[PDB]
Amino acid sequence: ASNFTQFVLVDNGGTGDVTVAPSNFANGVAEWISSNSRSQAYKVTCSVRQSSAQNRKYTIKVEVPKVATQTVGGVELPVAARRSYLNMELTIPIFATNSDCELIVKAMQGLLKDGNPIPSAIAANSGIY
Amino acid sequence: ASNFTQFVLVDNGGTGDVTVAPSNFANGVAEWISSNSRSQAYKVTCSVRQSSAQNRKYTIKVEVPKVATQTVGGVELPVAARRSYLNMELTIPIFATNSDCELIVKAMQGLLKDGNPIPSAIAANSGIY
Q: Quick one: a GO cellular component term (chains A, B)?
C-alpha cells in the first residue's frame, strides 16, 4: 500500500548500505533523509496529488550527495557538494487497477536495470548515440 | 557507455517480456517503441542536454499502454487507452566521475525496489501516509 518507513536507498551488498529514514511530513510531502549533511545527506521526497483529475500525479525527488565533494582536492569544508538530483513525475489514471499499477513499477524497474542503455549512459556520464 | 539498443522494458520471467526497440532519433531525442499501438505501444524517450551548464540533464519519458483499455468492458476500439506516463529529469554535474554516476543509478534502482515504500504506494494506487 505505501510506507513512510525506512528503506535502503543504496545497496552495497553488506552493512555499508545507504538507508533513508522518515524525517518529515511537511504538507502532503513525505520526506526521507540519511545520516544527513556532512559529505552526506541522501534526501528523498514523495508527494501525491490529483492533477487535472482524470489522473493522480506522484512527484518524487532524490538528492545524491555524490561520493563527490571533499573526496578529492583542497576545499576542506564542502557545502552544496555539487550533488545530483532527480525530479520524477508519474501521472496515472485515477482508477488504474493494481495490475495497471504493477505493470508501471516493472516498466520503471526495467528502464533502470544494470546493463541497460539508459543506466549505462548515465553511469558513464554519456549520451545514447 | 550508452546504447540505442533493444531492451526488456517489462520482465515477466519468460518469453512473454515487453521489449522496446530503437524507433527514432528525432533531434537529440532517442526513441524506443514495442509491438506498437494496438492495446500496445510501450514508448520510451531519452534526451540529454547541458542545462545551465555546470550540469547535464537527462530527460526520460515512458508511456505504459496500461494492461488497461479494451481489457474490460464495451468500447471495442480503444485509442488513447488512458495510459500512464513518467517524465523523469536527472540533473548531474558536468564532470561527475563514474563513481558519482554509478552511485546515482543505484539510489535510483533502490528507490524503486519491489517491497519498498514508493513502489508499494504506486502499485496499490495509494498515498505514503
A: T=3 icosahedral viral capsid
**B28/chain A closest Cα distance in angstroms:** 9
CATH code for position A110: 3.30.380.10
How was this structure determined? It was done by X-ray
And the C-alpha cell for B91?
A: 540533473
Nearest to A83 by CA among A69, A61, A70, A66: A66
Residues in a beta bridge with B10: B18
Of the CA atoms within 13 Å of residue A93, those in its CB half-sphere come to 18
Nine-digit cell string for A114:
544494470
The residue range of the domain holding B43 is 1-129
- Using CA coordinates, name the residue in chain B closest to A20: B111
Contact partners, residue A120, CB within 8 Å, separation at least 6: B1, B2, B3
- What resolution in angstroms does the PDB record give? 2.0
